[PDB]
């Protein structure tokens, strides 16, 4: 029995495990319980606080996987399936994981709180590529992750109901959080000192706690990768919530209370089943049950939220990768796949365009393919791809990105800004995919420190970077290293210089304007061509 | 005669002519200066298509440029060289339709091939007289038949009642029909080549060559066409039927006046009169916007201009065209608050957004948001440098850059075959502030080598320029080629396709060849934009 690996927090006893990473040992407690099980008549609803428990909890392994699709899309393909759960499916499913250095900190330590991707519908926080041992190993820092409700069980919503009020996985979040703070200080944790970061929806996810009132005191800093809650995909009006809900209702057999009691009733994997058919066009990176502007969790629109709140006393930091659209295309645009160069026809390329902005009216498709194309080669395949790619990144993260960071900075916000230009020299995808959409996760955590990874050393090196700035940035707000003087430094994004950095091999550079022009062509122009239509 | 000098008699249809021997830099040429070609185009025949010119008797005297078409004039810098040069320089008249012709001393021996320029001025302006176009060192020095003529400019020339007897509209390209013909019938009694005419004009006078290419009656009149900072389709060459009667109705109102009745009052104004009130018709505040231009009539042009480039046949054609630098500059300072010449006009985002609505009169709210997003610089929105660059661009493409891009795309993919430049050397003589670059208008006294005169204070460099400038525009009058037979060791001018887009540039530096014609920008005024309007 291991003192160092015997916690007690206020639910009673834990037993972690001791874990190897490359430059020594950490503790890990995986699988811990934050919520009752969100089962049987608890299905669709808020979280409820774990009840305590008797004796020692092993906390020696990942929990189960939340409810979830599974891409069968490549099946084997490994680019596809290390997105997939790797433990068992259920919806008893609210456990978090947490990793300190081996032995626990001395004293009060930042800690890093991660928040999954996957659409809303998918993710886990016990994927390689969130693995914790390295950020706590080599920079000492308390790792925390959640898994949180995905998909139906997660944000369907019957707006108003009782029994289906919505956001429930934004909810199991908050709870994590609330559970950090109660009980982190037993792990070494600095409840003082919580930076969220999260990649994609998680990105999201941590915008919407940045923009939700009770949220507010669980954490001090935020990292927002590849994600925002503004933008195209990551919240649905009440209206549309309703919507989709009563249509996967009709679609599985089923006054609100008698909808939600009939659904209460279907096996998870029903649900799963028809969720991807409630959307209202073709599409791609669009999802189809998100978080919801409900006027409780989200008092407004984000857009409304983000020009109209007061951030003084927040630091964030925020970025993107070089290719935030690549791999969106091989799920529904005709002419794209991971197996041949995806080059495709002018012909494609409108077509294309019509799915990856499914909303655009006619006009506004063709203000699009008219500012994506190069007028010296309208019929390039290549270019034509490549703008492909463009116009779905820069509509639904690149340019949303850019008006958040705009916002905040503007506001009273601290806000650092990077693109990642790194493409893993472990990648599986084709080439014409570039540094595509969730892959610069591997860095930050850490993963080329371990040597039978196969990264270069030069990689090995990228991420110590990396993981320098992200856990600078938890413990001061400010990714730049105190010590090294000549680098260059990291400047504050501001909307003035618009300043920000690129994150690759190279040392950091600094670069004016994110997608400067383009950007205001999608936040600027396009809802006024929208709004008449 | 008898006494005179030999070398300066010549017939023509209509009588007898004596020229005039004048001094070019490099040896004599022969002058030939107010050879009148209609009936003077007064009283009953104001407004109305020209006459040919009735035989007069004995030796017309043909020594001296003659009268100046009635026309407005420029008052906006009174005495400033860079305004008056393109002010008349002989007696306003209606009276006015004459042209004239330059030749080598003596004439040439075989059949000369002929260039034919028709100058600009908005339609409301103009001469074939005036010191820019003097045809001496084109003559001289490339041995070239030089022909200009005078045509009726403003209400005079182009006020129309569409479908009426008494002003049918598009007299002036009548004029200049004209003039064409009679270079067919006479210009062979100079040493001319009527199987070798090439037209070429600059800003209206480009859009007047680029009508007659439009134009069947003119087909037979010429072979090539050089059209310098203008063209037939865009915003300001021509106008609907329904907008020519709107503003003629107008004018009428303004000067206290059935068709035939309306037309009748009008001809009993004083010109004067019609002048001092023109302007006011426009339907909005604007720029690059004249009162009296061509109209779209079913008869000289069949369709507009856009319908008529895009599914014409151009084959046994050869075509130049190109563009300065700063199409926009010139025009900003007569109608956009916080642009002078006499300071730098640096100028606020709000004057920017003002300055939008005037250069682009026709927009909606939305499309002149479309034009303003579009070139406003995200990284510096409120720059004062670079949004008075930018409102020059605005009027510079919407008005020249992009029109061309647009008739040199069709005219290519559509038989023709196209050579296109840009025109970037700013005079050393230049009046205009540097911010104004190299403004509209300005490549003129180099294709005419103007800078040959000694007494012009030009800088050697600039005549060397002027010399190959004036090579390659005979060249391409010569064989639809700008590019010299012999001379291959000096780079090569491509022509344009819509495959490579290729155009060179014109300056003190050797040809260097360049891609796109604001390729990306002008898809936003070509493809876009009249989408955006239509809704
Ligand atoms: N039910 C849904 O909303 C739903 C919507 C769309 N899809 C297709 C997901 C296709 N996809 C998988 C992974 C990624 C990003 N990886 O980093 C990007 C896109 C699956 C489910
Ligand atoms: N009546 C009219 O149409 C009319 C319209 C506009 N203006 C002002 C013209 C002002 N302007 C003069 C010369 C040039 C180009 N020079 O190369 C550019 C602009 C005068 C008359
Ligand atoms: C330049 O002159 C114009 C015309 O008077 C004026 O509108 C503008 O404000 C001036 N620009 C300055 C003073 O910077
Ligand atoms: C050329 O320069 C000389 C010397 O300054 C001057 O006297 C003369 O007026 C100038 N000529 C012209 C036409 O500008
Ligand atoms: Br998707
Ligand atoms: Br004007």
Redesign the interface.
Known sequence: EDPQLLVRVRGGQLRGIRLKAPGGPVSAFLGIPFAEPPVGSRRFMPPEPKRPWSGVLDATTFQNVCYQYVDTLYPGFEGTEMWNPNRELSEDCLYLNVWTPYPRPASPTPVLIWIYGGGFYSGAASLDVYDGRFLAQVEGAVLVSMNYRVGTFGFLALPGSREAPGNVGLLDQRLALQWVQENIAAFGGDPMSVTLFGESAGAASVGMHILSLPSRSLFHRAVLQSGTPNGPWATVSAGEARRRATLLARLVGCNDTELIACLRTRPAQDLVDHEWHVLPQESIFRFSFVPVVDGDFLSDTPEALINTGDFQDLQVLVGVVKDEGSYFLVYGVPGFSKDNESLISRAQFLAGVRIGVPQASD?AA??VV?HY????HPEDPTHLRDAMSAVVGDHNVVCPVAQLAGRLAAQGARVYAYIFEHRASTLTWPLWMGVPHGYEIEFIFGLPLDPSLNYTTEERIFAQRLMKYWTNFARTGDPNDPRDSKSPQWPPYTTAA?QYVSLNLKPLEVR??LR??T???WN??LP??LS?T
């Open positions: 006009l063709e203000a008219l194309t190069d007028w010296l618009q004016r304007g400067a022009q950007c205001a062509f600027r122009f006024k061509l008449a």
